[PDB]
Amino acid sequence: PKKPKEPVQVPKLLIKGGVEVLEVKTGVDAITEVECFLNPEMGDPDENLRGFSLKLSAENDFSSDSPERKMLPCYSTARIPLPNLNEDLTCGNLLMWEAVTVQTEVIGITSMLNLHAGSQKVHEHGGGKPIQGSNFHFFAVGGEPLEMQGVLMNYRSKYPDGTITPKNPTAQSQVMNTDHKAYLDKNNAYPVECWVPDPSRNENARYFGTFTGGENVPPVLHVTNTATTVLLDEQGVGPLCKADSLYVSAADICGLFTNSSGTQQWRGLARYFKIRLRKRSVKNPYPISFLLSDLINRRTQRVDGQPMYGMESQVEEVRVFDGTERLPGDPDMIRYIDKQGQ
Amino acid sequence: PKKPKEPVQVPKLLIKGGVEVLEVKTGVDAITEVECFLNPEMGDPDENLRGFSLKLSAENDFSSDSPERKMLPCYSTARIPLPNLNEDLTCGNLLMWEAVTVQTEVIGITSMLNLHAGSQKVHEHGGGKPIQGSNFHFFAVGGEPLEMQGVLMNYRSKYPDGTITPKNPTAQSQVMNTDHKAYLDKNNAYPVECWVPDPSRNENARYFGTFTGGENVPPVLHVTNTATTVLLDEQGVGPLCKADSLYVSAADICGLFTNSSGTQQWRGLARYFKIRLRKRSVKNPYPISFLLSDLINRRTQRVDGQPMYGMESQVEEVRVFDGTERLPGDPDMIRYIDKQGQLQTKML
Amino acid sequence: RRTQRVDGQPMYGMESQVEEVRVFDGTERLPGDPDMIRYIDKQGQ
Secondary structure (H helix, E strand, C coil): CCCCCCCCCCCCCCCCCCHHHHHCCCCCCCCEEEEEEECCCCCCCCCCCCCEEEECCCCCCCCCCCCCHHHCCECECCEEECCCCCCCCCCCCCEEECCCEEEEEECCCHHHHCCCCCCCCCCCCCCCCCECCCEEEEEEEECCCCEEEECCCCCCCCCCCCCCCCCCCCCHHHHCCCCCEEECCCCCCCEHHHEEECHHHCCCEEEEEEEECCCCCCCCCCCCCCCCEECCCCCCCCCCECCCEEEEEEEEECEEEEECCCEEEEECCCEEEEEEECEEECCCCCCHHHHHHHHHHHHCCCCCCCCCCCCCCCCCCCCCCCCCCCCCCCCCCCCCCCCCCC | CCCCCCCCCCEEEEEEECHHHHHCCCCCCCEEEEEEEECCCCCCCCCCCCCEEEECCCCCCCCCCCCCHHHCCECEEEEEECCCCCCCCCCCCEEEEEEEEECCEECCCHHHCCCCCCCCCCCCCCCCCCCCCCEEEEEEEECCCCEEEECCCCCCCCCCCCCCCCCCCCHHHCCCCCCCEEECCCCCCCEHHHEEECCCCCCCEEEEEEEECCCCCCCECCCCCCCCEECCCCCCCCCCCCCCEEEEEEEEEEEEEECCCCCEEEEECCEEEEEEEEEEEECCCCCHHHHHHHHHHHCCCCCCCCCCCCCCCCCCCCCCCCCCCCCCCCCCCCECCCCCCCCECCCC | CCCCCCCCCCCCCCCCCCCEEEEEEEECCCCCCCCCCCCCCCCCC
16 A cells, blocks of 8 residues: 555636537636537438448449439538637737647448348358448548639539539549639538549648548558547647638548448448647737728729739739849849750 | 737748749748649540550560550659749859758549449449559659669560650660660650669659559558658758759559450549748859850860870870979989879889 | 750749749748738738
8 A cells, every 4th residue: 555646736627518618718728628520421312321322333434424412422511610719809919729639530330340231242151241442531620611622534524513523624624624623611512522622722721531442442440549639730730710610521431331232332421529629829910901901892892994913914013123222233134044955 | 718829920921822932032041832733644645534544455575565655654744943042142152942841742533433434343233443553653853854764674665755765775674774874854755664763863853652563552542731741861951953943753653544444544643742942052062164164165166177185196295394403313204293192113 | 054954844834733832931920810911802802
């Protein structure tokens, strides 16, 4: 027998629970943990094919694809409004969220070890067969609504609409045509195979996913409940719920569910999030001025002038100037040589 | 809470946006984020086999091989012109770019989840057989318009060259051939299977690729966007695009789309790259003379007549006089310099 | 001049399969913005 010690001063965590916790404002950056989930979006056909796409075709052809929503998982979003960190200020170092850790996960395996209600039979005397046939687990969350870049190949493909697919087909669309740039601002809109990050246009989202080819791929899961993911970086900063409104993203192709005739349809599933949060300081740059200017713009119309900047030029001129030069030899200097022989 | 907490004395972006930025004035470290990307070169049959190759042969022979371009990816390359730090620069310290981070990524798969559209019905009431196979995603980044090194089997082949293959067709061309040394200095021309690093020379390029042989071989990604790879080393360097022009280099075989006919043909896809650049300062490393020789003589004529030059010499002797000294009693010596000291040899 | 020369892809100007440069140097006491703004043609439209 030996002696007993401590407990500690505890950053309170009276606050507790689900969605309720949002409700207020609290003592400095205290910090909080959040349990939610967002469900799947397979573009599904059913409520039996809940967490599943519709069974699939094998072929069609380039020229000939146009599905319907039902085999078309689109991203699972929800935009999550968090209460403030920001409300009667002007200026100063203001606060955005930097939410510190999350574990979130595509949730729901154990039942799919059933192949004895059938699945599709493996063969032999052998029972059903699982689900599997490539899988993607991915998510990205960002404090921004997500700039996508749609990618098709086969721009002689077709598909519907709210199945917001990469928009504007070209040969180039097959290796993306500049367009197809989108914004995640609709729970399940962008069928996942159609949209791709306009990623470096999404700094303030962090994505990770692996799409996991082969052609049946045995999956593996790891419920070692301890990985912690910190929502930071090299500076130790994550995405910012700048807008304390959150664009949450994932795709988690659980695999292909082998509907009984080898009809396969995806199983994709719901995601969970357990979100460890903190109140973070930035520096207002949002002040009055910006409003003022804001103001004027509404206050205006929008006249159809004529266009002379960017791609519409008839303005010919951007140069900086600069304070009293001495007397260089010349002021025209090639800062990239242009080799063509050289 | 919200709060005027000391809000990080973060760096200073000044502007960003593409190409326009280059033109800029000077600001020491200076450093930059390149969000580029390259489209693939597959032998790209067309606008649909735009980013994909032509299909391929199946049981053959060296002998039974003439290539033609379409199936032939060659590596994708570029001179990216890079700013000149040195336009004015006149100091005895020299600035150069030294190359700091890339997080690049082969980009935009998502259509390729078609088990549909001609994806050879594997069977069942399940789907197709889409793409896949081996994949090689690779890139090399050079500072240089690099040393390639050609690799051929099959010098019973009948190869193209727009898809500039290596030349030379010894047995030894089938193993190393020290002559199939080349140099990538060409968009879609080194067909990939044909060419290999002359890595003995590749020292001022960094490449990373992992060629991933195998029948269908799965693509397992990662889509992080949250940790670069850094282009430094012991001496903190990557390629040296000494070249303020950029040698860009790549191959990204996604695998092969398998048509319903098993028309299999490589599929390649574009890579995005995200580069971090700084200004590194050096010494002089090379002298005036070595330079001078140029201007001068270059904006000039040649003089050579009866032959002297070389060795064809109505030239006569090259020796060393010099000094005035007592009397070595061999003085019609043969006076040398072993090189480091004086060799003094004769027959007398 | 002395250099050898090549063909590749056009990564600049119009013909750029590059996308972007993001100028750094200096510092600053961390604003709010996780981007840049300037004109109300940046910010506005």
